[PDB]
Structures are given as C-alpha cells and as structure tokens.
Paper text:
PRPP is formed from ATP and D-ribose-5-phosphate (R5P) by the phosphoribosyl pyrophosphate synthetases (PRSs). Due to the important role of PRPP in the nucleotide metabolic process, the stability of PRPP content is essential for cell physiology and is predominantly controlled by hPRS1, the ubiquitously expressed human PRPP synthetase. Mutations in hPRS1 affect vital cell functions and are related to many diseases and disorders.
Approximately 31% of these mutations have hydrophobic side chains and low solvent accessibilities, such as A87T, L129I, V142L, L152P and I290T. These mutations might disrupt the secondary structure at given sites, and may interfere with the hydrophobic interaction of the secondary structure elements, which stabilize the protein quaternary structure.
Residue numbers in the entry:
A (entry chain B), C (entry chain B), E (entry chain B): 3 to 195, 203 to 317
B (entry chain A), D (entry chain A), F (entry chain A): 3 to 195, 203 to 313
The structure:
C-alpha cells in the first residue's frame, strides 16, 4: 500500500529512508527538457496507494519545487489514494511574513501550490516559523531535530552540563530557551543593529550556537567571534538545515568554531570534502519512522521528544 | 458609498471612528435571545456599498466573534459591494501554533470563518504573530502601535535616552529589540524557568516592559518585581492590547508600576476607574485613516 | 477505529451514548481562558480514527459553538480519518431564512463554519427546517423523534386512539399531519395574528401539542389555554428540543398542561427539579445506533420509523 | 453598461422586460443540434458589462436549465463584469429536502450549478421554499407576487371582505395565513389522507385556493370539489407559477373554478386559448424594476 | 462494496457491464415529472459503498445529463464512499474550445457540473480531445477503442496489411497516424474548405475511415465518395461513438461504404434494424474490467493496448 | 489606474509594451538569493489598481514561473483591484495531456497555480492547445500570430500564390490548413515513422514550415531536408514561439532555411547575432492593444 518516490537524482536521503522501511524507491522518469521545463513520468501504477514524495537536495529551489509539484500532480490524477510530501527543508520558509513591507508571504504561496497540486498531508522538519502549519488546511506533522540535537550535545560536548545555548538572532529566542531548560543550562541572545549585542553570561563556558538554518553563514561566524570576545571557552554551532550557499564554506573553514553540526535534511557529502568542521546527523530514521507511523495511524508524536 | 457599523454594545471606539470620517454609524438591531443566540437586523440598505464593521468589546469573545460573523453575512447577502472588518484586536490570536501539542490553530480557524463569512478585507492592529496575515487569502492590513508607543515614551519618560525596553517572555524578543533600536537604547529579556531569569542590563535605569497584550497580568507583574530586584530605577509597562481580566486590575495596583499604558483597542473606561496608573493612547484616528485610505485607494502603509 | 468525544462538561448525553457503544469518552483538556476564549487539547492520538464529537448542553450557544468548531479543528489537523459531529439540537436552526427582512441565514452561516472547520459528516435530530440539509455539501443524517414520540403517545395516553394532534404554529403543519395520519387521528392548527385562531375540531378529545422546539414556552401555554377553551379534555405538549430559557419553567408550572414531554437532546435534569410536569425521553440509543450504523456502513434509515 | 439576454424561444417576458428599461435584448444564436445538444453564440461583446439573463420557457426544463448555464458561462469567460440570472420560476424547486427518502436535494444541486457556472447574483419570484435562498453563497433577491395577488383579489372578488383563503396542502399553511392576515379574513387548510380533509370555516363564503404552483392541477381540482361540498359560495384559484402540464388545462375547465389567476413567470398564451377562465397578472415591471435597482444600487426590497 | 447503477431505462450496456462483474444493477426509482424535471430515488442504502453510475443512451442529452447529476447527488448525500461515473460518450465533448468565437467551453462546464455534483472519479472512452482530462481536477481514466479497433481490422479486413487509414478531418491526424504505424500501413487526410482535399495515396487499396464520433454522417459519406474518386478499392468507416442523429441512417444506407463499424458506447439496436451496414463492437468487457480494476487498485492501463 | 510590471531581467518586450501605452514600468526589486530563492519587493502602492504583469525571459522557466507567481501574490495581498498576467508564451504548454502515460498534465497544474496565486485574468498568444483555455475558470484572452504571419508571408515570399504551408508533425494539421485556407493555397504534412513521411504536393513550389514553437529545431530541420528531397523550390520556417535551445541555432545555419521567422514572445536578440536568417515579427502593439482594450472594456477579439 505504501510507495515512496524521490525528487531528481539527489536520492541519498530518499534511498536511506527507503532502505529503513524495507522498500525500493518507486520508478520515475524525470528529466529537464531542453527549454528547462521538467518532464516527470511515474513508471508504475500508484492506483490506490499511499504515496510519499521526498523532496530533492539538488540545491536549485525552483527546479526542485516544480518537480515536486508535477510529481504530486502525476500521482493524484493517476488515482493515488493519498499523496504525502516529506519536505525536510520547506522552501521559502523564511518568507513567512510581510515584515512591514509590500512583499509576498511566499511560504503561504508555496503552501497553496502544494495544496492545489494535490498534496493530502505534509511531513517536514523544523519549520522556520511554527505558524507555517497555519498556512495549510491539510494536516502537517512538523518534526524536531531538538531531541537528536540533545542527544548529540550530551554525547559530544563534555562540558554540556555547564554550557550556554545562544541564539544568533532575536527571532530564535523560544528555540534556544527550550533547549537550555531541558538541558538545565544558561542561554544567551545575540541581536544585530552594523553591530551585534549579546545578552546573557557566556564567560568561561562552552557556547553552542543554535539556529534552524544557516545559509551564507555570515551571521553565525560574526556570532562566534562575539562569543569568543565575551569569554566563551569554545564555540559550537548546530543548525538543523545546512544550506551553505556562496561563501559559507570559506566563512566556516576560517571561522573560530570548534564544530559545525547539521542534519542531512540537505545533502552535505559535497560540502564535507571541502570543509572539515562539518559533522552530519542522520535524520532518516526520524523521517522513516514518521512515514511508517503515518501509514499505520501510530503516534508520530513519540518522535517530538524521542530519538527512534 | 461608505457605511460604518459597530458591534454589540462597546460603541465608543466605533462612534469615534465614524466621527473622524464625518459619518453616522449605520442602523442595526443587535441583541441576544433569552436562549443565548445572537440576533441581527441591518437597519438600512447596504446594496452596492463599501461596508466597514468595527469589532465590539462586550468582554465575551465567542458572542462577539459570532455577532461579527452574522453581520458580515447579512451584509454579504444584502448585496454590499465589499465588507472590510476592522478588528483592532484579533480574536484567538495566541492560538497560532500547535506548540508540540495536539491543539487547535484557532486563529486559522477564525481566519477561515471570517473568510467564509464573506469578509473581503481585514484591518487589524499589532497582530500577536505577523504570520497570522498568511492565514488569509484575502488581503490584510496590519497597523502598528509602534509609532504611538515611541512618541508617548519620549514625551513621558524623562530618562528615556538611558532606559531599557524589557520583554516579559522569550517570545517577545523581536518586538522589544525593534522598539529599543528605534530609540537607540538597551534591551533586556525575561524568561520563566517557576523562577524568573533576566538577561540584559537594567541596573540604575528606567525599565519599560513592552508586550502586545496582557490578560491576567500575572506574568507582567512578576516581571516587574524581578526588574525591581534587578535594580531598575522605575519600571513602566506598555501594552498595545489591554485585556485585563480576572485579578489583572488589582494585581497592577499591588505592583510597582509607575504607569501602565494601553491603546483603546479594547474598552478601558471601566478598568481605568479601578486603576489610577492606567493611561491610554487613542488609536481611532489611525483606524479612521486606514478606513478612508482603503476606501479611496490611498496609501495605507504610510501609517505604519 | 471509532473515537467519541464530548463538548465542555455537560457530558451526560455523550457518556450515555458512549456507554451504549461500549466505549470510554476520549480524553480532552477543555477550558475557557481568562479572556473568555476557549482552549481545547486532544489528550490522545486520533490519527486515522473515525472521530465523533457530540455537542454540549451547557446552554451558552456561542461558547458551545466555538468549542465544537475548535475541537473539529484540532481533530482534523491531528490527522483524524473522518470527523462527525453529533449535533442533537442544531444551533441557529430558527434562522434558516430572511423572512422578508435584511437578515442573516445564520443556520447556513453555521453550516458553513462547521464545514470549513473540518466536519465530514453531520448527525442531528429533527432539524427545524428539513431544508437545513441543503445548507451543507457534506452528508447529513437528520434523525426523527417521531417514532419514539409515537411510542410515548401509545404507551402513555390512554385515549391516543381518539386524540387530536395540534400544531402551535402554521409552520409545523406537515409535522402534525404526518403523526396524526400514522396514528389515524384528527389534527388541528393554531395560528397567531395579538390573538390565536384554531382550525380543527378538538371538542371532547385529548389534545397533544407537537412542536420541534420550545424556548420561552409563551406560545404553547397560550396554545393549551386555547385548546381547553375549545373543549379539549386535557392537553399534552411534546417537544423534541427542550430549550426552556427564561420564564419557561414558571410559564409551565402554572400552565394547564397535563404533561410536557421533551427528549434529552438538551439537558433537563436541572429543569426537572423545579418543574414536575416535565418528562424526558432518552434518545441516546437512537444517537448511539446512528453512530454505530454510520461507522459500519449499515442503514441509518431503519431509525427513521423504528425505535432501537 | 447593462445588457439583457433571453432564453431559447419564450422571448415575450424578456422582450417585455427590456422594453420597460428602454433597451433592446442582446444578440445571441441559441439553437439545438440534431443530436439534442445545446448551441450558444453571444452575438456581441459583453466585456466589462453588467449582464442579465432572463430564463426561458421552452417547456423543457433540462434543456432550458442547460441553455441557461451555457449562457452564464459564455458570458463569464467573455469578461463580463457580473452575471445576474433572472429566474422568476426556479427550476427543480420542490426538490429541496430528502423527505425521509434517499432522494436528491436537486434545488441545491441546481443552486450549485448556477454558482459554479459563474452566476454572481440571482433574482427570482416566490421561491417554493424560502430556505432555497441559503442554498447559495452568492446573494439572492426573492420577489413576492403577494402584493399583486392582494391587489387583484380586492379589485376582483366582490365579497372578499368575507372570503376564505384556502391552502391545497398542509405544506401551504404559512403562505395562506399570511395572505389571510393582510386581508384580515379567515383561513382554511386541506389535507389528503385517498380522502380529502378540510379544516377551517368555508361555509357560505368565497373560497380562494392559493398555491405557489400547480402542475397537474389534480390536487387543486380535487381541492375545489371538496370546497364546493363544504358549501363554498364561489371558489377561486390563485397561483404564482402556472405550469399546467398534462391534463391540467382540461381538468380546470372540468372544475368549478370561477377563475384561475397566474403570473406570467411562465408563458400562458398557449394555455389561455384552451382555457377561458385563466387570467394573468403581469409581473414584468416588478422584474424590470428589480433589474434596474440591482444595477443602480437602488433599494430592491421596497418591491417586496 | 461495489454497487453499479444505470441511467434512465436505456439499461442494455449497464446490465451488460453488470452481468460481467457478476452483479445486479442497483435499484432506482427514476421518472420524469409532468413538468419535465427528473425525479430520482435510490432504492437501497449505498452508505459507504463504491458506487458506479453508467450514463444512459436515451439520446436526449440534457435529460440524460441532469439525471446523471441528480443520481451523483443522491448518492453523495446518502454517504456513498466514492462515486464514479462511467460516461462512455462524454457530453458536449465537441465544445472543448472557443474556436476564435465568443462561445462556451461547454465540455468544461459539464466537467465542472459533474464535479460539484459529487463525482470522485471519471471513466470514459475516447474523449474527443485528450485535453478534456484537463478540465477536471479529479482523476479521469480515458479508455481507448483503438486496441479493439485493431482487433476488428485484423480479423475482418483481409487486405489490412495493405490498407490506408484516413482521417475525415484535420483534427484527427494523430489518431489515424497512430493506428497506421501500429498496423504498419499508409495514412491519408481529408480536409474541408465547400470542397474536400485529400492528401496521401489511397489508389488500389482498402480505405478505412477512422473518426471518434459520427453524428449526421454528412462528412464521412462525402469522404467515402472522395476516397472512391481517388481510386480506393472499397471504403470502411470505423467510429468509436455512433451518434447517428437525423439523416445519418439515410445518408449511410445510400452511401458507398462496405461497412460502418461502431462501438456500443451508444445504443445501436434500433438503428441496426433500419441500416444493414452497421456492425457493433461490444465494449462492455473493457468498461467492466475498468470498473473492476478501479475498485481493486489494479492497473487500468493494461486496457489501453490490450483487449480483455 | 493601470500599472505595468515586468519580469526578471528580459525587460525589452515589457518596456516596449509600456511605451505604446505611454506609461513607465512599475518599480520592483526582483533578485535571486545566493541559495536559489526568488526575492520580490513591489516598489510602489498598487492598492485599488488594475495591474498587468508581463512574463519574463530569463531562459529559466521554473525560476521565471515562480517569480511570476510571487509577483501576482504580492500584488493581490497589497489590495490591487485586479491582476492580469500577460504571458505571451504559456509555460509547460505542451504538457496538456497524459498521452497514454502516467504523466502530469502540467499546463493544468500551471493554470491552477496562476489561479490560486490570485491572477484574475490571462492574456496569451497562440496557445499550443486551444483547450488550455478550459484549464482556467478565470477568463482568458488568446491572441493569434495568424494575421501577422499572413501579412509577412504575402509581403515577403514572391511565389506565395503558389506556395505550400507544411506541418512538421501530424499534430499540426489544423493550424496549417487554416493558414493555407486564408492564403488559398496547398497544404502538406510530415510525420516521423525513424523515417520521415510527407503527404501533400510540394514539388516545384515554395514550402513554408509552420509550427507554434521550435525548441531543439531537430524535428523542423529534418522536416526541411525531407522537403528539399521532395523537390521544394525554397523552404521557409515560421514559428510563433522561438525557444531555440541546445543545438537549435547551429542546426538552423546547418539547414537550408531561406529564412526563419519568429515573434518576440521570447527574446531573440542574443540568438539573432548567432543566426543571420532569423527574422522577427514585433507583437508588442498587439499585446499593448489587448492590455488597453481589456482595461477600457473595449473589444479585444477584433485583434484576432
């Protein structure tokens, strides 16, 4: 009844998830046309199946989004019983508000486009804003890296019982507090004004920078400098989504981090060759379990504060 | 061509809004049946009209929301050209995420109901979350108390050029940092562990607690003590939405608040009498302007 | 697969229905906030379940309606397979038309709000207007008290073979005729102009007043007076929905009824202490069977003219 | 800015409506293909126009409904600003409840089709059920023959101040009681057990059978006998919708009807010739007024 | 779980399909009212069933379409689990475009009306335009006569290895080429300007006229004349839909065809008495299998190029 | 009251369109973030305005489509009165049928996205399929290059009164027969078996290959050889949409094409330099006229 498909050829995560469910990845014939439009062909009857499409890590976001939609489309008109998208890193998630400007809420637009395409259910990890669930009318299971993050912290940072959980921006207040309270440790908060301000004691402690995503890495670098200027022993940075476009690898390789930790919601294998500070958590068991629970009607909640 | 309608009782804000525009509020027959139902009769023809309903303050949010939806409805089936709802304080607005629970996103449910009721356009002020603008597919105009708050602060706090703007929770980091940045002064945050924790420098300076809304004031009155214990010279509390239910009023007088400032997005005339330090910024002109500018095709965002 | 929930704390009817299906009521954490908004929390995974929400008898209709919706909402985004509302007494049902006025069709509005909230199916009893089914696009099973009413009449009114079934208003013509024809007895019809007019013979017979709902009871009282003025032996009044707000208890206790019969679509236990003329039919087996049939795909029709 | 279009053939009512407004009916090319399909060509540009389609009377309701939907459609995709449908007699209108059967609610299906066809606004007369206004989410304006019926009665029944208004079924209680109340006279109801039963006092007075529509007239012609047997001085039958199919016409002449009054919501010019006593109230001015007032933003409800 | 119903009394095809699935046709009470509106009553609980409505061959298209819709409606509000319409010949299918005119896309309108009525899935055969699938948002299985056509051609035309597959119009280019290529034979193309032009060699070969539908038969007749004027041995005409309104029977009986082949997507029994050139392919096994596959989640594709 | 906005870069067509109407293109801030996202800022107030977005030509169709949807969106939530999208060349337009595969109908998916994005009205040119007008429920106006193609042919092919209009596929029968009929000349079709097959008389006459679009030009360059081998005097190729990706440009110069004519529905200024024989019909006036006539309520279809 359950059928999984991948997007494009960045199929590592999808095949990882497949393996763990004891399934092969469903057959697809997906190619860009000479004019840059995307062809998609579903190479096996999905008629009355519980279909799952895992979003690609290609990098190119619009080519990835049209492909994801077109697949959703193909699968619905082919009489799939239900189409879930496993979208580890939700596109345009940083565009969730107008910000006093005459701007689009592209997070919502995308939310609509997934919905018209024929999506029935959404599985994602760590939405940039919690409220992005509210841009949909269908159900959304937003999973957390937070328990595996806690796992990583405890098994890898000797001084985790005496660290500080810092936010690189004001927006990520709740996220860093929540982790600190569970770890029973202090928290601190960097805000940018062309200068950063730090509130909270970090002196003679290990500072851990927690964010949901890092893109160009300009911020976290400037934030690790600040933390080492205010007397932190050493600095870690943990991001659930490792986007790392442009000068990120350069900014990191130079930057005064001990380690940079990301999940494989985005492909890292290529970035890891050129950057020796990047460690990768595998989140495929979390995504696999989510699908598995979903298909059975078992509680996907048990993953919000437990590592399968 | 324009018509302005009010809510249950709570006419003051509306009456004010209709004044600044030089109109009289529209004829309506709102009442409650003996069995808790909400009864509505539109006392004039709204056919082909640009209508504006201003949300009431009966201090009963389900009754008020229902009356609001029943109005939009009567208007939409009486061939009104358009129905904007002026809801300065958006109902169920803190219920905008599951938060790891199996809980409703009620502000989405509410957005969806206003939508299906026939509301074409929304006007509100300081939405608890900015994202509860993406709950709608109809356009929303969200006004800010931010400029009126600033003006007041400068014109009312002698030491402001050395004051600290303080968030009562962690979830209020962005709102305060903004206010602190415009004023070019320090910011500080408080978090409930319970035991309260304060990050930021508040020693020997005027503290200004800033929240979008206070309900019980429990959190903000604690926030005040913690701030005194921290050695704040004088603590102030600014709130855009003053809900003040339960123990709220008494809790304030029992606190050290030099003053408490709110905008009349909710009727305070009752609670003012029971509280001396309360002070109100009048936001009607801002709502009236946004009504005219919407109607005229004039730039609303300027008021931001 | 089947899960039942109640609304608010008026849980008598809901637990009655639960008992009869051999189920416990699903766990909910429901409280009004200090500002009068309603919190709701579903205290157990409903993921892929056939959920049923039975509408509360609290009395306060708007607080009851938001709560019902919010629950519907919580349950849908929590991936319930299907959400049915068992709404014994449909709110705003008397507002089903404009009545030559510039008024809302609040019955339809409510019908829409249930529908956007995420309702998939509706189970109700004795809609004020049959056409209220037409305010929905989803399926609606409108059940009747009429067979149990007939049961009550036959077992409780000795002279039922020689009674008259009277309508308190013109609107309820079809309802009273239908009962009379099945009982093979006469019918009569009261209309209000500030005076009532009666058409149909009632002289030296037992008059039974049949309505779907009574609220303040002003009408039926004035209608029992009329009936006793036109020579009816004694007067009964049977209403499916016992609303009884305001002076109803006072109007009844004084009023010249032999008995007032209501179903427990609305709580009566409190009203029954202060009013000794109120008898209560239990309709929980009818509602239980309806749910039971629904969940199985058995014919809910068999209840329209049979008492389970 | 306004454009009025007609139906299949059945132009009379439309032509009349367009006259009272001083316009010419719009150019169209409505026909039937040899294989029962309905063909439509809008013979002019309706781009940006407030359009009005007046429902035909080919005495084929499925054909007519389809032609109506195909018109609304062609109009909506040819960029017409708005499409009101003038359907004096709403199709499938008695199919507004299951009635304990597993039957369709077809008037809801029909409402839904007009809706999805692109109709923005409805204008109809004496809806069989008032509730079939809540079938739509677009606004509906329902006109009443009630005032034209009354006027006629007073001006045509000598004894009216002592007459009885009689419902042919139980389901017609509300409509007659209303008419009886305005006239301040007696009301009486009939119910088919079959054997007919009469409740109300009709002895030695003029009886007036009032229904919204008659189809076979079977029920109403019986109703007439029962009323004579009851000792009615003279029986009359008023109907807002005169459908008169099957045996209807002959059944009337075979009855004792002093006269039978209908409104030209349906073409009667054919059936009149075969029936002497039939008399028509002309409701075009009422439809024309409601068209102008809708267009102008003028108060339509006054016509109620 | 599976329930089939017919439309009107033209029940031959529906009962043929029923027989083959080993089912009786579901009970319906369907009659036109005196005013020409259609009554429909579903004479047995379809609650939670997989319902199938096969479209009538009455001839009268609007009376057939309202009836089909009303049935769809009745079935949805009666809580059918899913409503499929088996619409062998899709109504208004020739009205799929504006054609440089201020005209309706009545194919789309119909597509919408089926969709609002409550249709969940569509099963049809040989849409006039492939793109008619795109007028729906629900799934559509468009089946082909083409494999059975190929079957008929091979078993009935001795010279099929040396024939020409001709199009009566320009629109039907792709259709005729595809058949010719599979049969490895030549193709030709008639276009109308008040004169027809033929492109492609037909000389001393058997010409087969292939169209999807023939209505009045004016075209194909004038096209068989042309083909015999350009030296074709004998002419066949194969149409999937035999509409044959008006002078068709007369035009055919006179016309120089060897044979006229139609499927029973439309009733033929009556036309066959008066016209001896009409042969009928039975397509009920193709439709039966389609339903059968649909209900099971088996691949309906296997019928696109195979004859069950 | 009108406002015209452009796409990514590809301003030429827009700039031209805004010229012929006497307006300046609207202020926007379109860019790409370093991580492939599309960023948009509407540089002015579109509140209550009839807006027109003209689709870009960055030669990246997913990027371009997304930027287009993000624009429509920003416009719709900034209270613009209406949003027409001028998409001369409709994206994913050949993906309008499954074609016996389990493939997407992407042009329906695309129609659905433009729709849900908030687009109220579409203007396009020579849709690959006429039916991809029924993909929308909002009205579409489809312009034809047909008259500009004809005019050019007559005014550029000396022998045209004895020429043959040739389809490169079987699926192009209707489009060519039409063109051949207006010109009152012969038509001929080609089909790929592969081996190419030609039906129609092209011997000793000028051949004109006519397609709606060419992408690789592979098919059309073969089509050209087959036509020479058939004894065509001079072959021409007219295309309404010149996509010319991959080997296209080189394939043309390597072919015998006397000339290749395209409309600037796509920027050709780059590919022209690399190809001498390419010639462009300027369709801006036709798009500008259709923009004004839409706005004014003026007859657009005349331009057909």
């Amino acid at each position: 009844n359950i059928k999984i498909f991948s997007g494009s050829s960045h199929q590592d995560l999808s095949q990882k998830i497949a393996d763990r469910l004891g399934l092969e990845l469903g057959k697809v014939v997906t190619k860009k046309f000479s004019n840059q439009e995307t062809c998609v062909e579903i190479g096996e009857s999905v008629r009355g199946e519980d279909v799952y499409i895992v979003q690609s890590g290609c990098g190119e976001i619009n080519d990835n989004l049209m492909e994801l939609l077109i697949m959703i489309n193909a699968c619905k008109i082919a009489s799939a019983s239900r189409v879930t998208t496993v979208i580890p890193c939700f596109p345009y998630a940083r565009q969730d508000k107008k910000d006093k400007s005459r701007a689009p809420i592209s997070a919502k637009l995308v939310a609509n486009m997934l919905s018209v395409a024929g999506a029935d259910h959404i599985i994602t990890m760590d939405l940039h804003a919690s409220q992005i669930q509210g841009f949909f009318d269908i159900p959304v299971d937003n999973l957390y890296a937070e328990p595996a993050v806690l796992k990583w912290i405890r098994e890898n940072i000797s001084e985790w019982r005496n660290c500080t959980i810092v936010s690189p921006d004001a927006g990520g207040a709740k996220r860093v507090t929540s982790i600190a309270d569970r770890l029973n440790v202090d928290f601190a908060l960097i805000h940018k004004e062309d200068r950063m301000v730090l509130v909270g004691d970090v002196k003679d402690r290990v500072a851990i920078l927690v964010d949901d995503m890092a893109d160009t890495c300009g911020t976290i670098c400037h934030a690790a400098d600040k933390l080492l200027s205010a007397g932190a022993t050493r600095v870690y940075a943990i991001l659930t989504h490792g986007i790392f476009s442009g000068p990120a690898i350069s900014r990191i390789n130079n930057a005064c981090f001990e380690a940079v930790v990301v999940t494989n919601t985005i492909p890292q294998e290529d970035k890891m060759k050129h950057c020796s500070k990047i460690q990768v958590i595998d989140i495929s068991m979390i995504l696999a379990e989510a699908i598995r629970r979903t298909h059975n009607g078992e509680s996907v909640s048990y993953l919000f504060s437990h590592v399968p």
